[PDB]
């Protein structure tokens, strides 16, 4: 199947992906509403339920308005049953509307439908090759008091009809008791609850089998990707066992969102991008797209500086999801704002690198403070506004242009208010121009680009203003003004004849897993692929063909490899690094150390010798380790994905600076169990 087809769950780079958060988008079924202080028709109060469904966006796939937008895979609410009650705070009624309140991760809101609606959702949507993803909150069940048993449904948890246990009287120990996090340190956002919302237990192996049993389920139904919820509030370590389950069973993407307050960017917002499997959606995007199109607080240095500074420091630029406003944040279009703002925020957004998500509503111009004011039910379905036919333009070059999905990002032409950047691979070329002066023409002079001579028709249709560009030799174009607010888009698209990786998914999996390797000038002929110096050919190369191959993953060690296509010719492609082959399935284990007391600024790391653990690499052992919450100093304690059935040797070691300090004594061993988790408690050997 080619690269763009709806088949491909594993990489979303050539998809604009629609946001909708299901109860505001449309009621295709009535019958369905919740009833009573529950439900708002006129969704007047935006904390209840105002009555949209599945059965609203099967409506509008089939009648044309996300199609005709040129859509090719929706973002819905979480799909699981959630508790029914209506929460009082303060005086204000609240419902789980938005589906982040779960009571049982194997049934469907029967708000938004049934099994049967959720299939015909999904096969509606492939016919019409929309790709449908999910949000799956996995860190909680819903609000809970464990002093008050009687306030909402208790937090608790059912398995297909059958409760599992309520947060009061949690002898099971399903759920974690620490209090409330005040955000001050992670570990203390992880363990605690958030609010108050009863916080699942990852360490319960009945918790970790059920949600990983809950997620194959799901992706079993067909569901092509999967947004999980509040990843900072989760421990990494069984995030990363929960990441290798879908991955060895049938990868899709997956992504999860890192909050970074303005400006403050952390690193582990970064590591955690880079090592727990996942994707995230860049809030370092999002935030310098409205400082510069929106509150002009920055200006084009800074919007450049984050295009250079992104594709640099993820590994994998091309799965991160950008956005320009989502639910968490106040709607890019405010009252007494320009819509041709939020028009160039759009066409930036859609022809940059990543993978684009459209809030819904956008389109309609939306306007809208934080939650719940960024979630009014969507006013109209009108197909004739200007930032609908700008999606409906640029939306399918995503498709049909691989460097706008692939391609590398150069900034071509900039000053304070103007940039033109390029988008590039192999022989496909986008170029982009954006002014966000809103009075003032700019005059551009000396613009080359990658271009092949011609007279090149601005793809949006002047719809922004935009113009021809003429192409001379060697990529220079001839001079222009770039009208007040203009933008244009103007490209190029050939064959490649070299092989050329636009993006590998999974990125993480065992031995035997097939991955999907995407891309230009594959070629027709069965080739190789290779991990490293490993050759895979004939019979493991599952399907070949010029923009994707799909083969087996083969039996090397764990650790990093970088991926490398040859055609049928011996032509070699680009290096993609950063691919995990794992040891096997993983498990999460928590190792406990006690009476390791540490100077300041020193802190307790784990390694040992899969690769899982850093390979006895000091520098890639897990850690720091945690001291506050579960356990206090001088113990130490974290939560480790580690390959299953099997024994690992390791080792505990203090780390302060440069200086490592290894425990005596003899290497630690311990035997994995298959499925499940598994705690480890050990005292420092001096
Ligand atoms: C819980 C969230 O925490 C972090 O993001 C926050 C951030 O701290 C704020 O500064 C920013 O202004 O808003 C973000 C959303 O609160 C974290 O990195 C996020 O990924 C995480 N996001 C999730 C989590 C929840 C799960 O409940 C959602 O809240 C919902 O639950 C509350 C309480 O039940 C409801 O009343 C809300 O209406 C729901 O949205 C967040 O929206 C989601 O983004
Ligand atoms: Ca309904
Ligand atoms: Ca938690």
């Given at each position: 199947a080619p690269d763009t087809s709806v088949s491909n769950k594993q990489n979303f780079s050539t998809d604009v992906i629609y946001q909708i958060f299901t109860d505001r988008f449309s009621d295709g079924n009535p019958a369905n509403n919740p009833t009573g202080a529950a439900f708002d028709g006129s969704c007047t109060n935006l904390r209840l339920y105002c009555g949209g469904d599945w059965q609203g966006i099967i409506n509008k796939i089939n009648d044309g308005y996300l199609t005709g937008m040129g859509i090719t895979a929706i973002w819905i609410s979480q799909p699981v049953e959630n508790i029914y009650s209506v929460i009082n705070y303060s005086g204000v009624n609240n419902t789980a509307y938005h589906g982040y309140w779960a009571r049982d991760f194997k049934k469907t809101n029967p708000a938004y439908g049934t099994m049967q609606d959720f299939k015909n959702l999904i096969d509606?949507?492939?016919?019409?090759?929309?790709?449908?993803?999910?949000?799956?909150?996995?860190?909680?069940?819903?609000?809970?008091?464990?002093?008050?048993?009687?306030?909402?449904?208790?937090?608790?948890?059912?398995?297909?009809?059958?409760?599992?246990?309520?947060?009061?009287?949690?002898?099971?120990?399903?759920?974690?008791?620490?209090?409330?996090?005040d955000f001050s340190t992670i570990e203390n956002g992880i363990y605690k609850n958030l609010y108050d919302l009863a916080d699942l237990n990852h360490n319960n192996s009945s918790v970790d089998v059920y949600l990983k049993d809950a997620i194959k389920m799901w992706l079993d139904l067909g569901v092509?990707?999967?947004?999980?919820?509040?990843?900072?509030?989760?421990?990494?370590?069984?995030?990363?066992?929960?990441?290798?389950?879908?991955?060895?069973?049938?990868?899709?993407?997956?992504?999860?969102?890192?909050?970074?307050?303005?400006?403050?960017?952390?690193?582990?917002?970064?590591?955690?991008?880079?090592?727990?499997?996942?994707?995230?959606?860049?809030?370092?995007?999002?935030?310098?797209?409205?400082?510069?199109?929106?509150?002009?607080?920055?200006?084009?240095?800074?919007?450049?500086?984050?295009?250079?500074?992104?594709?640099?420091?993820?590994?994998?630029?091309?799965?991160?999801?950008?956005?320009?406003?989502?639910?968490?944040?106040?709607?890019?279009?405010?009252?007494?704002?320009?819509?041709?703002?939020?028009?160039?925020?759009?066409?930036?957004?859609?022809?940059?690198?990543?993978?684009?998500?459209?809030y819904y509503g956008s389109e309609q111009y939306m306007s809208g403070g934080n939650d719940p004011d960024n979630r009014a039910r969507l006013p109209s379905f009108s197909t004739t506004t200007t930032a609908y036919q700008?999606?409906?333009?640029?939306?399918?070059?995503?498709?049909?242009?691989?460097?706008?999905?692939?391609?590398?990002?150069?900034?071509?032409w900039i000053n304070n208010d103007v940039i033109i950047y390029e988008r590039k691979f192999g022989n496909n070329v986008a170029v982009v121009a954006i002014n966000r002066n809103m009075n003032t023409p700019a005059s551009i002079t000396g613009l080359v680009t990658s271009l092949p001579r011609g007279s090149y028709n601005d793809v949006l249709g002047g719809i922004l203003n935009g113009n021809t560009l003429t192409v001379g030799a060697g990529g220079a174009a001839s001079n222009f003004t770039l009208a007040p607010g203009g933008t244009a888009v103007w490209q190029y698209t050939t064959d490649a004849t070299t092989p050329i990786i636009g993006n590998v998914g999974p990125m993480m999996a065992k031995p035997g897993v097939?991955?999907?390797?995407?891309?230009?000038?594959?070629?027709?002929?069965?080739?190789?692929?290779?991990?490293?110096?490993?050759?895979?050919?004939?019979?493991?190369?599952?399907?070949?063909?010029?923009?994707?191959?799909?083969?087996?993953?083969?039996?090397?060690?764990?650790?990093?490899?970088?991926?490398?296509?040859?055609?049928?010719?011996?032509?070699?492609?680009?290096?993609?690094?950063?691919?995990?082959?794992?040891?096997?399935?993983?498990?999460?284990?928590?190792?406990?150390?006690?009476?390791?007391?540490?100077?300041?600024?020193?802190?307790?790391?784990?390694?040992?010798?899969?690769?899982e653990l850093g390979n006895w690499d000091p520098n890639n052992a897990i850690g720091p380790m945690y001291n506050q919450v579960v356990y206090q100093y001088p113990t130490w304690y974290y939560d480790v994905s580690v390959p299953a059935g099997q024994t690992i040797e390791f080792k505990f070691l203090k780390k302060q600076g440069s200086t490592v300090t290894w425990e005596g004594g003899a290497n630690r061993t311990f035997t994995t169990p298959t499925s499940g988790t598994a705690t480890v408690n050990v005292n420092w050997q001096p």
């Open positions: 509606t949507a492939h016919a019409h090759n929309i790709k449908v993803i999910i949000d799956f909150a996995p860190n909680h069940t819903s609000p809970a008091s464990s002093d008050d048993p009687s306030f909402a449904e208790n937090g608790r948890l059912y398995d297909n009809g059958n409760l599992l246990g309520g947060y009061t009287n949690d002898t099971q120990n399903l759920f974690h008791h620490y209090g409330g996090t092509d990707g999967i947004r999980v919820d509040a990843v900072k509030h989760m421990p990494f370590g069984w995030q990363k066992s929960f990441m290798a389950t879908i991955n060895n069973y049938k990868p899709v993407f997956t992504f999860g969102e890192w909050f970074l307050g303005v400006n403050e960017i952390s690193p582990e917002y970064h590591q955690f991008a880079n090592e727990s499997g996942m994707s995230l959606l860049d809030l370092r995007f999002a935030q310098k797209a409205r400082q510069v199109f929106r509150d002009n607080t920055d200006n084009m240095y800074g919007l450049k500086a984050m295009l250079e500074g992104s594709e640099v420091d993820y590994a994998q630029v091309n799965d991160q999801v950008t956005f320009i406003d989502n639910h968490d944040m106040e709607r890019f279009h405010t009252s007494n704002g320009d819509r041709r703002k939020l028009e160039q925020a759009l066409a930036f957004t859609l022809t940059s690198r990543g993978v684009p998500a459209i700008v999606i409906q333009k640029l939306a399918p070059l995503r498709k049909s242009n691989p460097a706008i999905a692939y391609g590398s990002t150069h900034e071509r097939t991955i999907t390797i995407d891309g230009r000038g594959f070629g027709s002929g069965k080739g190789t692929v290779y991990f490293g110096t490993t050759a895979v050919t004939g019979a493991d190369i599952v399907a070949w063909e010029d923009t994707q191959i799909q083969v087996k993953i083969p039996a090397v060690p764990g650790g990093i490899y970088d991926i490398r296509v040859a055609n049928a010719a011996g032509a070699a492609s680009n290096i993609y690094d950063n691919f995990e082959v794992l040891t096997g399935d993983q498990v999460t284990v928590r190792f406990v150390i006690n009476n390791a007391t540490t100077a300041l600024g020193q802190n307790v790391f784990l390694t040992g010798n899969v690769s």
